Amino acid sequence: SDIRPYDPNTQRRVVRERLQALEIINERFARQFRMGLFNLLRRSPDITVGAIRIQPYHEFARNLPVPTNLNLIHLKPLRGTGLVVFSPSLVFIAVDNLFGGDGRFPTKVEGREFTHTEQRVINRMLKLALEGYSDAWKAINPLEVEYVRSEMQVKFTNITTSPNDIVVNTPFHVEIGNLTGEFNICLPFSMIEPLRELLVNPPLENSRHEDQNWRDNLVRQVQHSELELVANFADIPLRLSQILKLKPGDVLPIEKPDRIIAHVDGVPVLTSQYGTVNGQYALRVEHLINP
Amino acid sequence: GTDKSVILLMTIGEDRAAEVFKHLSTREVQALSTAMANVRQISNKQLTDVLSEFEQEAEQFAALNINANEYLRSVLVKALGEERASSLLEDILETRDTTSGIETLNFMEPQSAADLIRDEHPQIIATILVHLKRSQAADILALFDERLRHDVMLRIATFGGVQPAALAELTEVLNGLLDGQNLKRSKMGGVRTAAEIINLMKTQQEEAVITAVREFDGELAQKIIDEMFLFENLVDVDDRSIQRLLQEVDSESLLIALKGAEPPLREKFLRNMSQRAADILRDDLANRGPVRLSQVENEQKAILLIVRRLAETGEMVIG
Amino acid sequence: QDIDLIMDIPVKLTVELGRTRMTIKELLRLTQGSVVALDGLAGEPLDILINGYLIAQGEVVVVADKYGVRITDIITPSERMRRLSR
Amino acid sequence: AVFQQLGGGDVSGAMQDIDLIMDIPVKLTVELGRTRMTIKELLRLTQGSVVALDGLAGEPLDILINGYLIAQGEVVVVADKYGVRITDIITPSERMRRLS
Amino acid sequence: DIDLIMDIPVKLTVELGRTRMTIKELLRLTQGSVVALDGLAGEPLDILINGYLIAQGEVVVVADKYGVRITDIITPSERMRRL
Amino acid sequence: KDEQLQQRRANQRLGAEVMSQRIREMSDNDPRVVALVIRQWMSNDH
Questions:
Q1: Do residue A98 and residue A176 come from a single domain?
Q2: Considering A179, A212, A245, which residue would you say is the last residue of a domain?
Q3: Is there a domain that residue A4 lies in?
Q4: How many whole angstroms separate alpha carbon B47 and alpha carbon B41?
Q5: Among B66, A232, A249, E63, which residue's Cα sits nearest to residue C15?
Q6: What GO cellular component entries does it have (chain A)?
Q7: What CA–CA distance (Å, rounded) separates A219 from A216?
Q8: A163 and A32 in one domain?
Q9: Interchain proximity E39–D82, CB inside 8 Å
């Protein structure tokens, strides 16, 4: 028997789920970003998509280097705030290539911050990155990507209510010539959760008309399914002691039921007034309990 | 008129056109170079009429344009002095500013620029340097750490040209920083002013302040001492002091120093030696050809140092 | 095996009008004033349950201007077994 | 017959505002877990026994005020004192999911 | 008769915290706000049956599922002190 | 008409050859004045 003391703040919540739809969106975005980078840098980059990592937010935060450009982005209409992380190496490579450099010298990063010119270069790159990501998402679910803010430290973002929240991280590796760099795209699981059934199964070559026809027929098929409806006349609170002495012939007082709740497996569906019709216990339906 | 000017420049010749371009602004030179080789139009009558009309009006401004800056510089030099002429010329040059902030960066002090661009990416630093004036860039790299200095110099050696968009972005970034602020730090009072201030106070305070400066830095004290007594107050030295100092002044060094000196100074300094010695010195000065001021300045400095040492000892006076 | 330990724990007792099994179709077209029956004849004792577990049977009785359940019997397991079986 | 008989006082009903009742103490309670269990195992329980709870370890805990579930939070330890961190107010759908 | 109430289901809960608050305080709570608990760390958690306290015990996790070890059953002497 | 055109062309090619010599002496006298006049012409062209 395994029995160990409960320790809070321990990484005990494990939620592993393959995300095929994200697995293809990543390659589509990588292809779009590669040509965007070719268009900008006038060079030939190769982007390798890494394995999607489903990890608590503080793991993602601690694995990041300091300083690193973080780009808070809004993936409307999905409520939340995603993050696009550009490594110092990648921005160094881009600035070197733009400003008359054939990347001859090795990239040197020693905690140096980002100037206004570097920030503008990163904004120019991030415009292409966001356009590519939006186009890639457009195939499955049309989303609009808005860049709201850029930061350099990790403690300024806090896109997760708690550091133990679970986020989805995709690291890409971009190589230009001999130089290499990496950049990540992190989405909080709260944003993805309404689209989990869409992001879980691999996409199929269908149409929106076919999809809506599918659930329509399924909805119609569901309607022909019998349910069990239970009407509760009264709910009287008695102690255990009363129940054992309880014996036939006793009278347990109850209050006036103005309305009668009808529930299916616990969930209330109807409130209706009791009655007798055709020798049967009947209910006059008064109100369907809408949410 | 630009096409006519380009045609005239083409018909003038390579040397004349090159001289005109060297005496022309960057935009004008670029436009003239582009238009002349691009499309050239020759008119039997219209070109001749335009040339005659242009020639008929070049009367008053020609004399002004012949000598404008040189005359102003000479007037500034002769008016107050070399030190004030430099300040006046600097103010006149600063009156014409630069639009793009990159060029405005070379009017800033070297340390201010070094602090401003130290944190930038090394390639951006390199791009700023080739656009910046060479003298300024050298000072900036001197103030830069040796690692950054070597890295930026290497980037300078193997520069490969900037994308126009990136250059425009850097230009507007620097413009947004240095457009609405004045960078003309007025420098009033260096060492000439310090020497002038020192020369007018009591001797005890004079020696106290010069020894304090020497304790702080000997080079500054020596520069203050040299600026204290220039090679122009020797006319106010007493005849006895001049005769006493003549015993320790080399004839060749004295002649070299007095070759470029004022005639009054030579006459005053020739009354302390013998008549034969004065005649020999005059003959040597007449026979001496022109020489570079570098050696004459050193000889005058040596003579002034000897005179100052004699005065400090107590064997010389002034009047 | 304590007895006074749980001698005082409270339980909540519920009473039903009746069972009925009806599909999504009729449930969605139920409107205000619509009447639906139940599987029990008007007169059988209602089933008393605790935590969804059968405990007793009794019907409602009117004494003066007040209501209460008059329990008819207590179901032994044998009867519970035939309840599940049929 | 001292008390006077009041009746017909159902004039109307309308929410006024939530500050008339503000400084009223609430009984806040965080819940570790639940488990449906019968009396069978109940008396079988002795000192040192372990009862498994339906809630999976590490899941957000439940927060109730006066015994009514309002929000789901996460447990944290601050200065050696237990503390819950409110994460999300529950939805009517999860409320009924809890009920069933 | 014991056989009748020896089989019935009942709902068991264990509460980890207990705090008294006003509404200024409850409304002030936002997302991510940390609410302190009157209960010190390591003290026995209350165990309730249908909202009725019967026992106290420590928190322990077994096989990745929450649990509690019954340290003791409170005699009604402590109930006066519970209020 | 051909002879008159040829004579006019010869005069144009003689006086222009003289004009080219004339513009060289003036520019050697003042090189910056010519550049200033050219810049003024461009400014007035706007």
A1: yes
A2: A212
A3: no
A4: 9
A5: A232
A6: bacterial-type flagellum basal body; plasma membrane
A7: 5
A8: yes
A9: yes
User: A90-106 burial, b for 16+ CB within 10 Å, e for fewer?
Assistant: bbbbbbbbbbbbeeeee
Domain that residue E22 falls in: 12-81
D43–chain C Cβ distance below 8 A for any pair: yes
Stated in angstroms to one decimal place, the resolution of this structure is 3.0
Q: D76 to chain A: which residues are within 8 Å by CB? A: 8-9
Residue type, B210: I
- In chain C, what residues touch A283 (CB-CB under 8 Å)? 17, 35-36, 38
Give the residue among A229, A224, A225, A228 at the shortest CA–CA distance from A272.
A229
The CA distance from A55 to A169, in Å, is 7
d(CA B310, CA B248): 9
The structure tokens 């969605």 sit at C28
Q: Is the dihedral of CA A80, A84, A85, A88 positive or negative?
A: negative
Residue C76 lies in a domain: yes
CB contact under 8 A, F20 and B23: no
Would you call A2 helix, strand, or coil by DSSP? coil
Q: Which of A69, A106, A66, A100 is nearest to B125 (CA)?
A: A100
Containing structural domain, residue B206: 189-228
C3 within a domain of the structure (yes/no): no
Task: Return the half-sphere exposure (C-beta side, CA atoms, 13 A cut-off) of residue B201.
Answer: 12
| A174, β-bridge pairs | A47, A181
Phi and psi for A5 in degrees, rounded to 5?
Answer: -65, 145
CATH number at residue E46: 2.30.330.10
Q: Count the domains in chain B.
A: 4
d(CA B188, CA B178) in angstroms, rounded, equals 23
The answer to whether D42 contacts C6, with C-beta atoms less than 8 Å apart, is yes
How was this model experimentally determined?
A: cryo-EM
Single-letter amino acid code for the residue at B163: Q
**C7 assigned to some structural domain:** no
Q: Is residue A2 part of a domain?
A: no
Structure token pair of residue B240: 């006895």
Residue A73 domain boundaries: 20-212
Is B155 in contact with A105 (Cβ distance < 8 A)? yes
If asked whether residues B248 and B313 sit together in one domain, one would say yes
Q: For residue B82, which of B246, B227, B271, B290 has the smallest C-alpha distance? A: B227
Nearest C-alpha of chain C: how many angstroms from D58? 28
Chain C meets chain B (3+ C-beta pairs below 8 A) = no
Physical contact, E and B (3 or more Cβ pairs within 8 A): no
> Chains meeting C at 3+ CB pairs closer than 8 A?
A, D, E
- Per-residue DSSP letters for B279-306? HHHHHHHHHPPP--HHHHHHHHHHHHHH
Assign A260 to helix, strand or coil. Answer: strand
